[PDB]
DNA sequence: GATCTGGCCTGTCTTACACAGTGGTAGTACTCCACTGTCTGGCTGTACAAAAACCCTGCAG
DNA sequence: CTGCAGGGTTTTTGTACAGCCAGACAGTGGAGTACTACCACTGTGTAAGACAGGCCAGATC
């Protein structure tokens, strides 16, 4: 909520940490596997009628725009 | 002196390029030593050119570094 | 006169920065364990300097020229 | 050429003189550079005639041995 | 006399290469989970002295 | 006036029974958690080398 850089946020945590510090924020590390309970794809589900056309799998997150361009050169790009 | 100084300043060896001139002059050495060039006195382009490339694969192949245009400073150490 | 130019006088800057190093100056004097009340005087400070420019900076909202591209910091040490 | 003429020239008299090489260059500046730009991008106050103001203030605190002391950084 | 063309410089552009950054990853090393006893030092109910700097007061000058 | 010393005088200071419990010392088995350097990637500045064309010398027109 600030657009700090991750090295930013590594760098004032040794600094604050060093400084009367009973380790205040979290380490970097932590936020990685912490955001895991807030993006996409964590969250058990189902519908029912089942979806149509639409994968039943769900513990997917962010994809690649494309869904499948066949690669192919000549063909449209 | 052609110019009025102003600003009094004792001057000292750049300690940051300090190689790129020593650089510059052992490469035109390998060039010309792979020429005889104490044979053939005054080469022109060609054989130039030829010196060149002939030394830098010879570099590539024996400690691996690609040849360049300009000399930094990784590449002179 | 529209080069615009930001400074200090420089008698002021060295105060700064020499009430700055002041804690070190005197711990080293607690090292060489020199007397205080007969090390007030004679005194020697040794400064260097430089001055270099950056050229035609990049700068973000500048599609015209504001003139957001030399500068050429004068500093000291 | 210039380089071989200074390195095979004077080392000796200019470290007598002086005591050191490397302590004297200025090979620092090219690197403050960097952090001149990065306060530009980051601390303009969007007027050249407060922008210069504005980045020495931010650049002298960044030197000053006081605030590095307090990086220690254990 | 008045002008052509190589020999040479340099001012200008350009082009490879370097840093600069950032989120992700791997490799590493420094902090505790819990078991169990067990020693050390600073808290608590009054009493006795020991030091200490100002204040009075004697008496010396 | 002054300096100096017996005691005052109040404050400060340590030593003193006497019981209690916080806080630490070892180590165990290695997890593990914090840290520190790759790492893939291009944007930005940089400055060596093209180079051309302009100019002087050679020699000419
Ligand atoms: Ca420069
Ligand atoms: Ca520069």
Redesign the pocket.
């Given at each position: 909520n600030t657009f700090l850089?991750?090295?930013?946020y590594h760098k004032m945590?040794?600094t604050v940490?060093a400084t009367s510090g009973r380790?205040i924020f979290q380490?970097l590390?932590?936020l990685?596997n912490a955001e895991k309970e807030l993006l996409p794809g964590f969250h058990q589900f189902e519908w029912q009628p089942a979806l149509k056309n639409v994968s039943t799998s769900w513990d997917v997150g962010i994809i690649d725009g494309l869904s499948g361009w066949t690669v192919s050169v000549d063909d449209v790009p | 002196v052609s110019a009025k100084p102003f600003m009094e300043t004792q001057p000292t060896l750049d300690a940051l390029h300090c190689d790129?001139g020593n650089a510059?002059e052992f490469y035109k050495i390998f060039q010309d030593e792979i020429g005889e060039v104490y044979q053939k006195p005054n080469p022109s382009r060609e054989e130039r050119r030829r010196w060149r490339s002939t030394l830098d694969k010879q570099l590539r192949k024996k400690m691996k570094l690609?040849?360049?245009?300009?000399?930094?400073?990784?590449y002179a150490r | 006169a529209d080069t615009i130019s930001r400074r200090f006088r420089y008698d002021v800057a060295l105060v700064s920065a020499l009430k700055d190093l002041e804690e070190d100056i005197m711990e080293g004097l607690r090292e060489r364990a020199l007397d205080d009340s007969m090390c007030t005087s004679g005194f020697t400070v040794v400064v260097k300097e430089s001055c270099d420019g950056?050229?035609?900076?990049?700068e973000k909202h500048g599609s015209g020229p504001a003139v957001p591209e030399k500068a050429v910091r004068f500093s000291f040490t | 050429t210039n380089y071989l003429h200074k390195t095979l020239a004077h080392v000796p008299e200019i470290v007598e003189r002086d005591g050191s090489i490397g302590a004297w260059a200025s090979e620092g500046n090219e690197?403050g550079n960097?952090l001149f730009?990065?306060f530009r991008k980051m601390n303009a106050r969007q007027s050249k005639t407060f922008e210069l103001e504005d980045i020495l203030k931010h650049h002298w605190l960044y030197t000053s041995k006081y605030l590095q002391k307090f990086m220690e950084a254990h």
């Open positions: 850089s991750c090295s930013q945590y040794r940490k380790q380490p590390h932590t990685r | 790129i510059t690609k040849p360049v245009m300009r000399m930094n400073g990784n | 950056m050229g035609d900076v990049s | 690197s960097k730009r990065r």
